[PDB]
Symmetry: C5
Subunit: 310 residues, 5 copies
């Protein structure tokens, strides 16, 4: 029969969420319960009830008695796994409890930056069996799988946690078992409002205020300054994101703001050219419409963003 093996995984400390490379590094604890009748021994009172083994001697022993063992292979591993503790307790009934406390990095294909930064993300850890379902099978421990009390992260909040089992057909032609610990996560919006959004509002309001200065050269100079500012903020945002292949919300916001500020520059230049022709009346009439439409233009852009991306 296919012997049933119990799995319990626990992400204790999420040490980082590096979105640039699309990975997250965590400290995890893995527990495996496996009842193998052959490993049962004969013990006397006074002797220990449950033996303790380190990994190397345990595997050499199982090589001596010629017994298959499950091959817990991490599907989403990244970089080098850092085994910290690996202990095995062997019971008289023939049950091995395997503890592996580790830290490692895992990739998460499902970043959908279509709603950055408001987007909710979905991280997941996979534990597949190298040997197929015909030999072994993976169950779930009752009250041990999940997350911990203190995650030690500020930028990300865990909303929901889940665990289950599924079947794959990757390494062997037969079916194999994969234990999945899958948790959603959110982003705290305090940063982006504090040190991105507010400066943009301040600079855009200064740009709007500069419209009615008259003597249309200070207007051009201030507009050039604002161009510098948004280009710097584009640089910061560019650093903070990966080499994304489809237009994101914040990227669209910034490119639209670039286009609008350039339109402001060109508009003041055209008004200056008209004033060069001397037709002051045309400029005087157009200024009112321009200043009335500019914030209206921004609100129209906000409405079209909210409609299109939601």
């Amino acid at each position: 029969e296919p012997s049933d093996v119990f799995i319990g995984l626990k992400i204790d400390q999420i040490t980082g969420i590096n979105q640039k490379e699309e990975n997250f590094s965590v400290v995890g604890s893995l527990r495996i319960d496996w009842r193998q009748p052959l490993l049962a021994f004969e013990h006397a009172p006074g002797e220990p009830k449950h033996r303790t083994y380190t990994l190397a001697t345990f595997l050499k022993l199982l090589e001596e008695k010629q017994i298959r063992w499950p091959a817990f292979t991490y599907h989403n591993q990244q970089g080098r796994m850092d085994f910290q503790n690996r202990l095995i307790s062997l019971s008289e009934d023939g049950t091995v409890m395997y503890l592996e406390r580790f830290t490692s990095t895992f990739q998460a294909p499902a970043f959908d930056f279509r709603l950055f930064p408001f987007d909710n993300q979905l991280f997941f850890i996979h534990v597949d069996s190298i040997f197929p379902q015909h030999l072994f099978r993976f169950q779930e421990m009752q009250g041990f799988s999940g997350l911990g009390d203190q995650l030690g992260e500020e930028e990300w909040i865990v909303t929901e946690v889940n665990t289950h089992l599924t079947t794959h057909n990757e390494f062997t032609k037969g079916d194999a078992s994969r234990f999945v610990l899958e948790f959603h996560a959110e982003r705290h919006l305090n940063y982006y409002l504090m040190r991105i959004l507010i400066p943009v509002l301040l600079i855009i309001t200064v740009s709007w205020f500069t419209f009615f200065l008259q003597d249309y050269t200070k207007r051009i100079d201030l507009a050039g300054g604002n161009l510098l500012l948004f280009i710097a903020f584009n640089f910061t945002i560019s650093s903070d994101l990966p080499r994304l292949g489809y237009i994101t919300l914040m990227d669209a916001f910034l490119v639209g703001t670039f286009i609008i500020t350039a339109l402001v520059v060109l508009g003041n230049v055209w008004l200056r050219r008209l004033e060069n022709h001397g037709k002051q009346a045309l400029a005087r009439k157009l200024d009112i419409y321009a200043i009335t439409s500019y914030p209206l233009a921004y609100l129209l852009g906000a409405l079209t963003l909210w409609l299109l991306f939601f």
Copy 2:
């Protein structure tokens, strides 16, 4: 009975306090004293009184004689533990003295940046038992636990050190012992006064001085320059902090200064617009109130900061 095991830990050199990732890396020394009657031997004069073992042979031996051993698992470990020395001295009475000199990084969930940079922090190292309290128990060595003579750090000053034992219920259903070495720490304020605060005072004083220049265009230009400066300082502060989720004191200071400088820009623009209407008397009357209230506004902000955050 639950055999009593003595623990002594010593952080010799704190190699770094990386707040961006919320961790601190230290060089530590661990000592374990464990009296196991079975390990006692029979020795003759001429033979060594206390044997010496390296870790691998020691564990293989304990696997040969089938004795449980404590599993010192670091709860706050981060990255990979770097074992440097691991020696064991075995005495005739049956006492093993285990030395483990190491260096590693540990996470500290309790950063409360609500009082940055004045805030006091609390770092702590945890040594839990994988096996429950029913088998083993952790005591404290008398005069060995604590810190060292020379820490080799400048940015942080250790104020108080403490050590104790506590019980957890994480890895097993039973109770288990955790030895905790917990030390508070402070920040030296010399930096932030030297190369953050003073430049801000200089630039804000220049901004205030620019109020009474008359011919309100140099005022606008200087205000734009000051905007550039505070945006650069916002960039520096943004780099120096993690992706914090609740508004910090320095962040509030800088965002308020942004708002005030933008208000200055808008005020000079509005005065220019009023002068365009020709009502020089209104601008002349308003300038006195503006220049009188501006430093008063800054002092009011300082008072509200001191009240609200303390």
Copy 3:
């Protein structure tokens, strides 16, 4: 006879494509099938049909029975190979199935940045035999070699995948077998259009608009600003590329734009000098030709780029 050895390699997750150092890091899975008659055993019902071994014990065993084994040496390895899992299944017929799941970085000599960023690239992994073809030989597994369902990369798209075998004469005087997994790749153009091309168009259009301002000092100032902007964008592009030895397309675009903007600066200066001589008619006549030719100059440059680099 030269025993036939089957190879199957699978790049599951491409963790990065670092073009600055000219390498790409991937998570890979390797499978080796090798039928060795000597390793066949004699088994009884009840005993396992196929034994399982870890690498260390397996190699010690093959050293005990004195059998050669293939030496899968990676030709393009870079940095340190990170063995994650290494298992061997030994069958009664005398067939070893060797699994090696790993992650590592590989160099790719064939980056031809002559068409950056539109250029298509060609990555490849090589598995050579340390022992010559006279002893062993490498075949290809039927339906296992290739790539996976989810690559977890956004900036690069795999267009075509291929696998084959070839002969080399590097390590030994005799012929040896190399298994090659070679895949082409493309670049997503969304970034460079979003946050490089559009800002350049905006700034160049502002530069063109500045031509007809009259009172040729604002022209000089705006041209200097544009010079600053293109120098910043040159800095960004310089960071994003390796220390390339032959002029790339984007580099040529930027250097040409530098030359054109400098020509604009010099032209406005020369017009100012002519106006100093008072010959306003010459400047008035030359301005029309300059503004008519400037965008024409840019289109001529675009045409010569498209012709020369394609």
Copy 4:
């Protein structure tokens, strides 16, 4: 008796001096000479006179014959020690020559940046005994300890080298031996004069030249530019130093220059305000005193720096 053990250490290549984290990484060679009578063997002609061992087999052997061995523990180790070669030659007389060629990073608590960059520094490597002086003792090899022919460093010059032995009471209650290799080092001043000092002199001289421009608005603008420049240089210097807790010489120089430039800005603004009142005579009289005192102010600052910091 306490057996005498000879130590010889040699820093061959100093690979880096990272002052930001207060450490320096070096490639070192360690030699230990230890005469143990028990290890003596009985050999025949034809057999090797001095046996050679690798570390693992040697330690297993000493575990078989039950002999204590010295525990060379590095006190200033940092990060992970990288053993490259570890050989032991065993002589018929009973002398082991242990070679350990390594590379590793060591911390240096004694950086006194009070005289940056002119300050001389003092690096040191410590080799302590885990076992106390009652058992073993550390001597010094005659002509092997010291530095090498080619250090391969440019920024730092070794002035003096020294070696000795001392006693500590850290790991055990008894006395223990520490071998110390301590070398002073200097800094080459070519950089800071080339690419820090000269630009500061150029910009400060431009600031002084700007004093007598008349029409006090270009003065204000140039002063603002100079403010930008010194803020950029403050950024560079800030990057180049650690989070130092007591004011350094270069930091004081830069903060004083900030204060003086801000005073220049305020002075030109006050002169502009006085000119607004029309009292041109007061400004004309004050300009001479200001321009006469400004370089005098800088020389007074230089004199007070030289006096106070020396």
Copy 5:
């Protein structure tokens, strides 16, 4: 007699040349041929002619039969050696062929930046014997030492390759053999002309053009802008080089350009001061000489650079 040992080393892929830390990382292959009569065995037909061993078992065997072995110690190793493959083939005649395929970083003391960037560099790998020449000696393999077909580097071109043997007296009092693989290298000049030299020429030509603007305030402003530009380029060059202790060619070029631009600023200021006195004739006469001498000054500087540094 001193047994002759053959060495063949091959740098297959030069993965990086990091001049900032003065090192270069390469992927290398090492081959050792050593004829030891004792290791010869007695074999029968059917048995393998040449045995194959991994490093650990081989060294344990040589420890069992008590035979010295050469200790290939890398003199220029840096960081941690990363053994990738280590195989040994043992022949019936008594010859061991040792293969070690690796990747590692090596330091190169001989960077002479006196001719940066035109300077030619000289990299070299050293393989010394820990045991002296009295026991072993190092020969050179005939047609295996050297470099490979594809180096996979763009910024550096290998001009000449050489190999030889020499004697040292470092680790032991006796003479010892060092095998040296030494190759010169060059720099591709395409970068520095493309994205350093041309922008400098453009900005310096703009500075020269600004001389004859009249109304000497735009001259001062443009000169300040040029000062900003060269300071930025000084920052870039400063990043790209190590903390060099003797003035380099590019550093001298940039510092001279700083001095000349500052002289331009001061000259325009002095002309403005003379115009303040009203003596327009003196300024008109001096402008011609200044504009005639400025490019002449640059050519004189180029000539003195070419003479002094060559």
